[PDB]
């Protein structure tokens, strides 16, 4: 039971990777290459008014 189950990651490299993922979420060709169906969404990034 004393094998290594958890991994330590530098916090700077964590923050780099999450920012790189947010940028890729605003590229419509990448959304389709990950299997999403977005042929009828008006704009990307998609923003809705505070009606929720």
């Amino acid at each position: 039971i004393w094998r290594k189950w958890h991994v330590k990651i530098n916090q700077g490299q964590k923050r780099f990777a999450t920012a790189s993922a947010l940028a890729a979420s605003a590229v419509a060709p990448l959304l389709m290459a990950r299997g999403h169906q977005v042929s009828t969404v008006p704009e990307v990034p998609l923003v809705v008014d505070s009606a929720a």
Partner: protein, 141 residues
């Protein structure tokens, strides 16, 4: 900026959800891909200008992307249906590719794909019956 057609091909060159890989070749089930091959030249979803052809009820249906609406996918395609005559469809498709400098390298492929779709809408002729060579003596009894 940080994103272009060359960058997008770099992150999708090795795997994407359109890929179909096995022995004897690699294919792509992409809508904006003519010849359904995996390559930078034919990867329609990557490039800024691309062409795609699907069969219609009577003729063919052709889509192309508008470069000014790359971030508005609902209104980013220009769609035309050709259902009058074969030669008329060939001409309009060829002009749509190699007249204003919009992917003149896809001129030969676009015409040939429209030809294959219209060829498959004709009636299918019946096949001749199968003959026998070694089971013939077996069934002669």
């Amino acid at each position: 900026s940080n994103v272009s057609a060359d960058l997008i091909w770099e992150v999708s060159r090795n795997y994407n959800s359109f890929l179909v890989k096995q022995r004897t070749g690699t294919f792509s089930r992409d809508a904006l891909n003519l010849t359904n091959q995996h390559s930078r030249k034919h990867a329609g979803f990557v490039n800024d200008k691309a062409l795609g052809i699907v069969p219609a009820e009577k003729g063919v249906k052709v889509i192309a992307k508008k470069v000014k609406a790359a971030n508005k996918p609902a209104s980013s395609l220009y769609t035309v249906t050709y259902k009058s005559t074969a030669r008329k469809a060939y001409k309009a498709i060829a002009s749509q590719a190699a007249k204003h400098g919009y992917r003149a390298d896809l001129r030969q492929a676009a015409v040939a794909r429209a030809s294959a779709i219209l060829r498959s809408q004709r009636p299918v002729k019946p096949e001749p019956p199968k003959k026998l060579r070694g089971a013939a003596a077996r069934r002669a009894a």
